[PDB]
Amino acid sequence: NTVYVGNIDPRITKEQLYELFIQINPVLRIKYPKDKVLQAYQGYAFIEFYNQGDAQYAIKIMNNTVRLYDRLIKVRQVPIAKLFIKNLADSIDSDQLVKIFNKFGKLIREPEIFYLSKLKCAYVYFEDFEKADLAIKSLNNQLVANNRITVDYAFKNGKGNAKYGDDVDRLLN
């Protein structure tokens, strides 16, 4: 219900802000942070309306509309499976990783290739712990691109606890 405001003159006072934005919509509160060191505001604010619709409408109407001391005001709005894999082949592109792990599970993000020791390793993000269980079951200690690869859980000691299965199960559901 709160909208961000920016490009504010430090000479602007909370009174002037309120008088401005009440024209658009009823404003529940205005948090307009000040530096208590210098007693000087930082040129931005947070304006909390009563509901969301007033916030969105205010964003639409008041963005880049008004110049306060020539300054044009800005108005704006404002946990997953992971697998460590070791001994990868240098011929394996991240896209080839994607094609490998898609059949096992849907990737929430892209894998991350990093070198340890020289030693090609990667992190693979799955949306499911069970799909990752399939990826480990089939892919663990398996020869691809003429190189034996090891698939396990990435450390945090690693993922795959019981609470991990429960809360990941919930985040999926």
Added chain:
RNA sequence: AAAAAAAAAAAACUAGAUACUAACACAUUUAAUUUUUUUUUGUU
């Protein structure tokens, strides 16, 4: 070009520095009456 959604000082010990509170108390106090204490030993 951007936004940073509002909390930090200590504590202890030992000494030293300085404000301050409480209509606090400060020259009256003595004519009924308990410190008045002795191995009793004051005689028509």
